[PDB]
Amino acid sequence: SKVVYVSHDGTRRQLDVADGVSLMQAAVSNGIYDIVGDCGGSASCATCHVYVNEAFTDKVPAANEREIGMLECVTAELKPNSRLCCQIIMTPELDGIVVDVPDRQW
Numbered sequence: 328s329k330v331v332y333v334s335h336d337g338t339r340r341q342l343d344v345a346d347g348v349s350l351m352q353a354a355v356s357n358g359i360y361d362i363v364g365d366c367g368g369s370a371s372c373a374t375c376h377v378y379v380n381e382a383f384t385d386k387v388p389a390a391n392e393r394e395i396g397m398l399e400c401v402t403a404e405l406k407p408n409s410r411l412c413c414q415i416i417m418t419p420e421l422d423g424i425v426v427d428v429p430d431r432q433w
């Protein structure tokens with residue numbers, strides 16, 4: 328599998344999220360820890376407003392609107408494609424997923 332993050336300006340750092348990890352976990356090292364969420368796997372912040380591709384946000388879980396409530400008033404706008412970086416794992420099923428960065432960074 329593979330995982331590449333993007334920035335609202337294009338800056339995208341590629342990496343490999345082991346199986347059973349979250350783009351946030353691989354972020355602690357890959358450096359996305361700075362270009363990813365903040366509260367971590369937890370869901371109390373809104374800086375993890377990442378904008379993922381349309382073919383990789385499917386394999387991931389279907390986080391209802393529950394966790395969306397806090398991700399609904401984020402500092403930016405959200406769409407069905409956005410996802411709290413602290414709520415998506417990159418299993419061997421998804422490969423070469425394209426994650427993006429919110430319009431802002433809280």
Ligand code: FES
Pocket residue numbers: 363364365366367368369370371372373374375411412413414
């Ligand atoms: S990283 Fe804090 S809510 Fe997702």
